[PDB]
Amino acid sequence: TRREAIRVLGLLGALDPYKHKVNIEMLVNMGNLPLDEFYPAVSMVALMRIFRDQSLSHH
């Protein structure tokens, strides 16, 4: 299957990647914030990442 995909790509012909593209968190925060406020706001971010997922129903 991969060999056939290679055959397909070769059959389609050459292409300019320029023509292709034309025609088709924590560190930044820590540099300005005090960590005593940031890291609770990291724990909250992780908690909310888990919260919005179905696995919350298990944990």
Binding site: R3, L9, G10, G13, L15, P17
Partner: protein, 241 residues
């Protein structure tokens, strides 16, 4: 003798292939040697094995946002045209259309001399280079010097059948008028600018003679084309003057 094989494609190969391992895609590529020898059954096997090796290389180049993959992508194109060569000689009826397909495929490749030369290095096994004059005109249009003046000189020698290294003083060639125009543009891109202008005047004169001969329906296709060339030459006869 891989580098020797890269030149022996245009010349040798049976000797140089023995020093290329089979486990690199160049091994299969230059063993399909098989295309010089009309060994189609071996050629298909080598092509498929090359597709396997290029799969191994593509699964690595896929990481870098598919930017380097262009190189491997070109190899895919190369491999496909090998099969076309196997068809090109084998079936005369598809031959007319394989030339058009090869043209369309070449229109998409990046304007790079080396990859282009590899493409025609594959294709020239079955088409003589002086037949596909449009493709070599585009080769001339790749750059002002076509990469370097030696390459432009060789392209002109191929298209003309004339050797300016010995025949620069010769009058204008009997080549198709487009290549005459290209050759004079190349002469203008040198010290002999005044002589290039005089040759342009000569070319306009003889194309006017041809147009006078071409006053007829059956040759109007030339005449219309000739008008364009005359127009171009006249435009140059202004600016060059």
């Amino acid at each position: 003798a891989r580098m020797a094989a890269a030149a022996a494609w245009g010349l040798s190969m049976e000797e140089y292939t023995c020093m290329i391992p089979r486990d690199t895609h160049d091994g299969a590529f230059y063993r399909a040697l098989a295309l010089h020898q009309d060994l189609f059954s071996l050629a298909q096997q080598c092509i498929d094995k090359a597709r396997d090796l290029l799969d191994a290389e593509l699964t690595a180049m896929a990481g870098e946002s598919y930017s380097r993959a262009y190189g491997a992508m070109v190899s895919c194109h190369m491999l496909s045209e090998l099969e076309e060569v196997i068809q090109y000689k084998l079936v005369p009826e598809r031959r007319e259309i394989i030339r058009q397909i090869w043209w369309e495929r070449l229109q998409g490749c990046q304007r790079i001399v080396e990859d282009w030369q590899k493409i025609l290095m594959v294709r020239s096994l079955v088409v003589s280079p002086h037949e596909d004059m449009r493709t070599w005109l585009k080769y001339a249009s790749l750059c002002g010097k076509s990469g370097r003046l030696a390459l432009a000189h060789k392209t002109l020698v191929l298209l003309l059948g004339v050797d300016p290294s010995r025949q620069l003083d010769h009058p204008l060639p009997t080549v198709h008028p487009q290549v005459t125009y290209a050759y004079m543009k190349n002469m203008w891109k040198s010290a002999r600018k005044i002589d290039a202008f005089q040759h342009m005047q000569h070319f306009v004169q003889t194309m006017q003679q041809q147009a006078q001969h071409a006053i007829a329906t059956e040759d109007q296709q030339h005449k219309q084309e000739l008008h364009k060339l005359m127009a171009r030459c006249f435009l140059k006869l202004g600016e060059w003057q």
